[PDB]
Amino acid sequence: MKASGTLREYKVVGRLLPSVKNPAPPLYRMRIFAPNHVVAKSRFWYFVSQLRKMKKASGEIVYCGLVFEKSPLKVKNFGIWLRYDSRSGTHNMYREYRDLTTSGAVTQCYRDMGARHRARAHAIQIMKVQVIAANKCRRPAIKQFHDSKIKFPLPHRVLRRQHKPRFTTKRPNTFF
Amino acid sequence: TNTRGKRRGTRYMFARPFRKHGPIPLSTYMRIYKKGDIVDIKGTGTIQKGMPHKCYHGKTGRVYNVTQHAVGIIVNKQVKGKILAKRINVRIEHIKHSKSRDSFLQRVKENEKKKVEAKKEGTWIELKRQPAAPRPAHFVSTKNNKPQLLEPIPYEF
Amino acid sequence: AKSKNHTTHNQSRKWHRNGIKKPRSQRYESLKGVDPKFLRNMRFAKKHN
Amino acid sequence: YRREIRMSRMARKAGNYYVPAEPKLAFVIRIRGINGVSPKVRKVLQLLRLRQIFNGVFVKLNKASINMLRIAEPYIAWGYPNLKSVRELIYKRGFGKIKKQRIALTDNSLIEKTLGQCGIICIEDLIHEIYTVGKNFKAANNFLWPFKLSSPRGGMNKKTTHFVEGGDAGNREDQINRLVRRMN
Amino acid sequence: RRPARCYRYCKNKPYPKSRFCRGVPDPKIRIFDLGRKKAKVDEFPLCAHMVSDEYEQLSSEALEAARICANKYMVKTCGKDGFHIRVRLHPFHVIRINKMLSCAGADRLQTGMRGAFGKPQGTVARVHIGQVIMSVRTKAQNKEHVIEALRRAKFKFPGRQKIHVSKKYGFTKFNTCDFDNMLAEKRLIPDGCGVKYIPSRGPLSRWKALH
RNA sequence: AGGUUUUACAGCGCCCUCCCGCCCCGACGCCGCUUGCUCUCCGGGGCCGCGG
RNA sequence: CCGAGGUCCGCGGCGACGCCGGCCUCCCACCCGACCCGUCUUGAAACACGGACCAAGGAGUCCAACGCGCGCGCGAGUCA
RNA sequence: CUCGCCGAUCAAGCAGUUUUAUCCGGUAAAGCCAAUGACUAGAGGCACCUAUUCUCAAACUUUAAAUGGGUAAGAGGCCCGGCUCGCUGGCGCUGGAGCCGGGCGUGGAAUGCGACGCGCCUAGUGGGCCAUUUUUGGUAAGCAGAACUGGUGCUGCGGGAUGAACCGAACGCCGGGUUAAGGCGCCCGAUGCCGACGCUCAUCAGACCCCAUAAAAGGUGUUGGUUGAUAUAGACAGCCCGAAUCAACUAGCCCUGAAAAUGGAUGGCGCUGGAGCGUCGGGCCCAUACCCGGCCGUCGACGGCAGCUGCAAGCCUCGACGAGUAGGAGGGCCGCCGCGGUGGCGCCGAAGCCCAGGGCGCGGGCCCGGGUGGAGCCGCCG
RNA sequence: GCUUACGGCCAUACCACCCUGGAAAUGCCCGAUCUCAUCUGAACUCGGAAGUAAAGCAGGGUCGGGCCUGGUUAGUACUUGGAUGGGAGACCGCCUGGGAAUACCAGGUGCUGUAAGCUA
Ligand SMILES: [Mg+2]
Ligand SMILES: [Mg+2]
Ligand SMILES: [Mg+2]
Ligand SMILES: [Mg+2]
Ligand SMILES: [Mg+2]
Ligand SMILES: [Mg+2]
Ligand SMILES: [Mg+2]
Ligand SMILES: [Mg+2]
Ligand SMILES: [Mg+2]
Ligand SMILES: [Mg+2]
Ligand SMILES: [Mg+2]
Ligand SMILES: [Mg+2]
Ligand SMILES: [Mg+2]
Ligand SMILES: [Mg+2]
Ligand SMILES: [Mg+2]
Ligand SMILES: [Mg+2]
Ligand SMILES: [Mg+2]
Ligand SMILES: [Mg+2]
Ligand SMILES: [Mg+2]
Ligand SMILES: [Mg+2]
Ligand SMILES: [Mg+2]
Ligand SMILES: [Mg+2]
Ligand SMILES: [Mg+2]
Ligand SMILES: [Mg+2]
Ligand SMILES: [Mg+2]
Ligand SMILES: [Mg+2]
Ligand SMILES: [Mg+2]
Ligand SMILES: [Mg+2]
Ligand SMILES: [Mg+2]
Ligand SMILES: [Mg+2]
Ligand SMILES: [Mg+2]
Ligand SMILES: [Mg+2]
Ligand SMILES: [Mg+2]
């Protein structure tokens, strides 16, 4: 997996190929976060083939569609349970994020797992994504934005547009 | 370098299966091998007479000559970059009837069985074999089969 | 002054250059090596039909 | 097009799922070069009529064809073309093989002269017989010279990697149409 | 001898002391079980391993040195009869050494790489990733001493090792959460240091002997 | 945790209904995939029209 | 005429060298590229060998016999 | 040369490829509580004996892959009748084989391709080297020796600063377009995006295949994470105070570990809200690659001809293609000397030589002009 | 159903122990004159018919051993092909496909051809 751009959520369901010995085999639904549906279908045959005895050729994919955010305009606290393989071993890890959409929070997790732990997208296995209430948040970086009447300035504004005037008699102001 | 012995490296191919030693079952002796039939070559270490060479163990050819205890086979053998038709003499204990063409002869009789029905019914049922076609469109019911949510399990050392 | 002993490195590319042709199984294959008693009677069955 | 929507709608209304028929047509584009090819992959690309980079062919999808596409996977980028892909490829890049020659499909007389026995007398017959594969797909597809496609306008992600892991090789289900609009 | 950097990686096929490899010196380690080895299963419930993280080969001298390092710390912290250390790696791969290559000579049949196949030098234990090196079973309250005893013995080994407190009961292959339940059902009987699995698929006379 | 205890001198959820209460905007500078042949004397830039 | 690939049934300033033209070649300048050829060699710009420069000379021939292919004459003959 | 296309994928036939069917194997793995051999520990029973147990095999194996090897997927078939035999024999039909005649295309997997068809003659080479993987000897080697495939030798081009072999891509002469691999602070084409989030300070920072070294072990540097334990019956720390604290472990970057000789190397400059590290987005830059077109030649054509041409060895049309050492073949209105013919040239200036003159040909070379020179010379067919 | 003759596959058929059964048949059994045969009529060979189930044989039994089949192990181990993936390395992850074995658990335990005979 590459995790190109945003990691949209896909509901990929699948089942073994039906036969006369086993007609109507059980259906398995997965919660796959992938950049596109082609990778979502491929991620499905990676997590399911290691849980059940069914490969891509042994079974088929019944449905693979987008799972849209039910509240894109509400700030939510996301608790993500994941496991990643570091250079030494595999570690279970729980991380909290705060985004508007579930796919946005999972996308933050891949950017954060690679930044803080040098984990590549193929080494990360998102196990559980859950909308956590503000009472049940464990990370202090998330709980600081759980303050009503929150107030903070924007100190020391770094100058962007450094090349619109590339040369100028005015030194930029950083206080606003 | 290696030796050019006729049985170098045949420690396991000419050996007998586990708990399958002893005398050769006599049904293998009473099998009729005519001329032109497809036979396999599987040497046996029990019968040290008329053994095929290790290069023919696992090969398949047709019979051209039949004798008292053996049979003449025309086998293909690639030496370096050319394939040659080898006429080898192998006793019947090291060969068996090849079921490779049996699936073809079964289809030939079945093709002639289904096309004479067309001359008597007036249909055009296709006789050609076809590769596995893409799966047709089907409905997957969830009446008593709800999709079960699977999740990757945590790591355990 | 030692050299290289044995190699089959470039041989496969040389074999398939002109192709690995299978032996042409011509119709009415020859009767060399058949049982002399069988051939003797077969030549008697041809000079009398 | 409307039938597959009706079948998908009636299954969801009952709470079930409608699995569409697996695609019967594929469009294979050779993405890797010609130097340094494995002899097994090299033989497969010759049987797919893909002897140079960035050329395309239509492949009737069956187990005999899919296992040839899997055995030449790192050198191709194939998928399931839609009608617009099949239509625009035969219109803009469509060249017929009249007498072992690459002749542009400028008139229907060139299709009727070669594929007239198969009932294919117009260029829409050639599009219909390929998009919806028929009893004469082999003669129709083999009549079409390998589509000489241009370089992908906008570049590729990375050529030496499979499409799922962030590259472009392998099988992209319907994303091959995005690649056709940029190469055709 | 030659430093362990030269015989660290499993580069050759396993070369055991056998009919063909004659002349192997005795391995440095000859004792693999120490402590109160004649203890019952219910006496040492806890079990901790020294799991190997790398695919390498540990010399018999390192297995002997780490055994002594782990043994001495268990005696001073748990008593000589409060543990049972089991070195679970037997050195069977024989490493070879070439001749003492010198300038030249009119004898020795060679001077350089001519006839380079060397004589047996020592013995190493080819360990795999996840393979247990040493196992120690102790009482439940001696967990801190076993982790430290195995931690000190890692410095006598190359590569990376992990100290893992197993969920199995002692040196058996049954979890602690299932061990005491199987003793009540007479499915396991104490046999020396461990238990012997008794299925329900034998002669019924053996079932009557248990009840 | 706004107002003085859960709506009050702000608001934020989650259920039961009310024709889905009913109307209105359909991926729309809040977020996807495409024509079921997308339509345009529909604009602009560059390159060259060789032959006969 | 969106049709078997271009035409103008459009046009301007200079035209007897003063102020016009000359690709390449000469000199000079700049940008980019660019190590010395030959030879043996797995590998040469090589700290491998030969070569300071120029002219002239300088190395697959002829004979015998053979093989195959081809041209030719005649043909169970053919060659004097 | 035999054909096929011509004369209808007519169909055969073929394949470094699949599919279907059918066999072959003893390697990886696994196993030894199964045999052979090796090996640890107790326990039970009257040193052994029984039931267990730890750890192994390349010259061990019950078991057993992946990849792979062979064969079969039709008219050379299938079915039927008659006849022949000295072979075979209870049984001229008992086998068997041969011969002859008749019946039945829905050519009875996919894809591709004119048959890499049948010959003859034949040079060069017979020092190789390298890479992924597999693999033997060796402490190791830019060591030595193998296996598959590619590359290279024989090969330039874009990129890796540099380079034989890495990455991309193989090459007629060009224009436009777009890419690959790799890049876009400056050298140096392109981010002069109001790029996203985080990590990171180094008094030896770091800076991307091959690749141009660094480890064990440590850090109360810093950021994550895991698992416990005390806490408003008042903890931790400090000597009562009043709210979180403590411990172990682990993982990133950084730090220690970390010493060589001429002065020096992320390529250089330099870069620290970055020009560093990780995860990514958009745009952009150009290879002899791809696409379109022009031209040259080669090849093919299931090709075209008995106002202009028709030197048929000519002319015209269409399509594809173009690297190359050793080597082979072809073409030459390339060049040189002489001969048989033929057509000329020359004291109004031949040959040769010289030229900042005009040109032709892809090229070998050639023509013309000017100067010098002073007596011979050239074209064409052989 | 059963008893024999010849078999086919060659343990689902073997091995241990226990129980049951003689209608025909089989076996044991009764003898050594002849054929034959040995140290020895035990065997072999021959002659026979007093007894009828002790053994053979057959059929049952055993939470039987073994064997057979399936499940589990396990989509694990390993493995085709791919990357300018990670890591100092050892090695590991992913992509694309193929895919084991023991322990453990469960079931089963001869099938059948030709010929002759018999309904305890
Ligand atoms: Mg030998
Ligand atoms: Mg010999
Ligand atoms: Mg003999
Ligand atoms: Mg020598
Ligand atoms: Mg040699
Ligand atoms: Mg040699
Ligand atoms: Mg390459
Ligand atoms: Mg590659
Ligand atoms: Mg000039
Ligand atoms: Mg030389
Ligand atoms: Mg040299
Ligand atoms: Mg040098
Ligand atoms: Mg010199
Ligand atoms: Mg000269
Ligand atoms: Mg000769
Ligand atoms: Mg030769
Ligand atoms: Mg030679
Ligand atoms: Mg070497
Ligand atoms: Mg070459
Ligand atoms: Mg090259
Ligand atoms: Mg470099
Ligand atoms: Mg260009
Ligand atoms: Mg650069
Ligand atoms: Mg460290
Ligand atoms: Mg220290
Ligand atoms: Mg740290
Ligand atoms: Mg450092
Ligand atoms: Mg072109
Ligand atoms: Mg060339
Ligand atoms: Mg002369
Ligand atoms: Mg000059
Ligand atoms: Mg009895
Ligand atoms: Mg049993």
UniProtKB/Swiss-Prot annotation, chain A:
Its main location: cytoplasm. It comes from the Eukaryota. One of its GO terms (cellular component) is cytosolic large ribosomal subunit. GO terms for molecular function: structural constituent of ribosome. Keywords: Cytoplasm, Ribonucleoprotein, Ribosomal protein. InterPro entries: Ribosomal_eL20, Ribosomal_eL20_dom, Ribosomal_eL20_eukaryotes. It is found in: Cytoplasm. GO terms for biological process: cytoplasmic translation. Pfam families: Ribosomal_L18A (PF01775). HAMAP family: Ribosomal_eL20. Component of the large ribosomal subunit. Belongs to the eukaryotic ribosomal protein eL20 family. Component of the large ribosomal subunit. The ribosome is a large ribonucleoprotein complex responsible for the synthesis of proteins in the cell. This is Large ribosomal subunit protein eL20. It comes from Danio rerio. The gene is rpl18a.
From Swiss-Prot, chain E:
One of its GO terms (molecular function) is translation regulator activity. GO terms for biological process: brain development; embryonic brain development; regulation of translation; translation. Disruption phenotype: Morpholino knockdown of the protein decreases head size, but not body length at 2 days post-fertilization (dpf). Show decreased formation of actively translating ribosomes. It comes from the Eukaryota. Keywords: Cytoplasm, Developmental protein, Ribonucleoprotein, Ribosomal protein. The keyword Ribosomal protein applies. InterPro entries: Ribosomal_uL16, Ribosomal_uL16_CS_euk_arc, Ribosomal_uL16_dom, Ribosomal_uL16_euk_arch, Ribosomal_uL16_sf. Belongs to the universal ribosomal protein uL16 family. This is Large ribosomal subunit protein uL16. The gene is rpl10.
